[PDB]
């Protein structure tokens, strides 16, 4: 799937941060692609509301 | 009541001791002494008495206890642990013992 | 009113009312709307109220009951040294839960005796009639 960061990290839980980190997004505006597999897509369920996502 | 039988049955720590369970049924005038690996749900010896005993009654003890221990020594089963059930260990089943206690 | 013997003390919490939201014992029944507390006298109130109205004498079912010890410290001390002695007793009435059932009177008597009853309480209230049939 296709990821973009639009809402920041500040004021948000330890885990949701650490997922935004260990997804690879380091600042808003950031874009990315992702292996449509469980674990790493369930790393985009978890922090969904921070990412506008494509398909 | 049952109590005694299930009591000894558990003081034969089922398989964990390693050895071989040795049943009995001296509550009738037809007995049944058996040999079990209990873990494996199988029986490995078998000295009955219902296919003609001898003629004796509680003298038969040492005899089916000699027949059992014989079928044992034949099988290869060289080690004992003595189950019972509702039994005192003193007379009849004690004979079965003594003559199994040196009989295979 | 009060109870007989017990534990002594308490605390508090809320979220909707278990049972029994159904019209047993009576034809007509009055039902809470707010997550109140209710007191010994607060109910003995409605006892004596409705029991005025019905005359001799109706049939009146107080489906609620005070079991909660509520305290107040001695007036005028700074906190600490204890928990308050038991001030009064409370039935923890939650909403939809039904407090009063009566029959042996008519519709008008239910309306009015329940009106006068509910003008004695910390809650808006609705009166109604049976049909809640999961178990009579």
């Amino acid at each position: 799937m296709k990821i973009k960061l639009v809402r920041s990290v500040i004021g948000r839980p330890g885990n949701q941060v650490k997922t935004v980190q260990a997804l690879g997004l380091r600042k808003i505006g950031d874009s990315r692609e992702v292996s449509d597999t469980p674990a790493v897509r369930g790393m985009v369920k978890t922090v969904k509301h921070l990412l506008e996502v494509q398909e | 009541r049952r109590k005694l039988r299930t009591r000894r049955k558990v003081r034969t720590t089922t398989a964990a001791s390693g050895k071989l369970r040795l049943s009995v049924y001296r509550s009738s005038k037809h007995i049944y002494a058996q040999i079990i690996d209990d873990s494996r749900g199988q029986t490995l010896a078998a000295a009955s008495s219902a296919a003609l005993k001898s003629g004796n009654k509680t003298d038969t003890a040492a005899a089916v206890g000699k027949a059992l221990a014989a079928a044992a020594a034949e099988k290869g089963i060289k080690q004992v642990v003595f189950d019972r059930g509702s039994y005192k260990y003193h007379g009849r089943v004690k004979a079965l013992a003594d003559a199994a206690r040196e009989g295979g | 009113k009060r109870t007989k013997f017990r534990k002594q003390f308490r605390g508090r919490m809320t979220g909707d009312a278990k049972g029994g939201d159904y019209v047993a014992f009576g034809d007509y029944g009055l039902i809470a709307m707010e997550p109140a507390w209710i007191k010994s006298n607060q109910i003995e109130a409605c006892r004596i109220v409705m029991s005025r109205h019905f005359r001799r004498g109706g049939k009146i079912y107080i489906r609620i009951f005070p079991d909660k010890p509520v305290t107040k410290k001695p007036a005028e001390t700074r906190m600490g040294k204890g928990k308050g002695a038991v001030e009064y007793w409370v039935s923890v009435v939650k909403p939809g839960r039904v407090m009063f059932e009566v029959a042996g009177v008519t519709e008008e008597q239910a309306k009015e005796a329940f009106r006068l009853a509910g003008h004695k309480l910390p809650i808006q209230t609705k009166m109604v009639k049976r049909e809640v049939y999961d178990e009579a």
Binding site: - | - | D16, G57, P95, K126
Partner: protein, 175 residues
């Protein structure tokens, strides 16, 4: 009666005013949803011994007695119904409201007509000829007489699941 839907998602209804649903034949069981209006109408018309027909928006009329209702305890309206699709000859253990008949002589000396069991769990007439109510004459009762489940009547071909000595409608003293 008549439904249209049967999914798991209820936005097809609710606001548009329909009730969550089940109805089992006992070899056939089906979830669905039925408009509030009609259900309330008929269910007070016909109630827990009512029996009525299910012409699903497909074309397959069915035979339905009402089994369990489950409602919004706060708003005090119903949100769900369990059905029992009737069979043929043998039915179930019908629940039926005891009534009272006649100007009783029990209420002339200060007493009161009290139904110590508003509803009665019988057994089987046959699922097409069911008693809706019951009629327990009370006139003979004075003050202090109860009516056990023996004295309760019958319409023929029915049995009483209830202990024949426990108290249904008994007169109470004044005050």
């Amino acid at each position: 009666m008549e439904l249209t839907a049967k999914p798991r998602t209820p936005k097809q209804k609710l606001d548009e005013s329909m009730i969550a649903a089940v109805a089992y034949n006992k070899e056939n069981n089906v979830s669905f949803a039925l408009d509030r209006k009609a259900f309330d109408r008929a269910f007070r018309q016909q109630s827990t011994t009512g029996l009525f027909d299910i012409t699903v928006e497909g074309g397959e009329t069915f035979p339905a007695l009402v089994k369990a209702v489950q409602m919004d305890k706060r708003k005090r309206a119903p949100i769900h119904v369990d059905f029992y699709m009737v069979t043929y000859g043998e039915p179930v253990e019908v629940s039926v409201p005891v009534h009272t008949t006649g100007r009783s002589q029990g209420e002339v000396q200060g007493g009161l007509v009290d139904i110590v069991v508003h509803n009665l769990q019988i057994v089987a007439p046959g699922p097409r000829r069911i008693p809706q109510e019951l009629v327990v004459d009370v006139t003979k009762m004075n003050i202090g007489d109860h009516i056990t489940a023996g004295d309760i009547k019958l319409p023929e071909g029915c049995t009483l699941a209830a202990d024949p000595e426990l108290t249904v409608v008994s007169v109470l003293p004044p005050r």
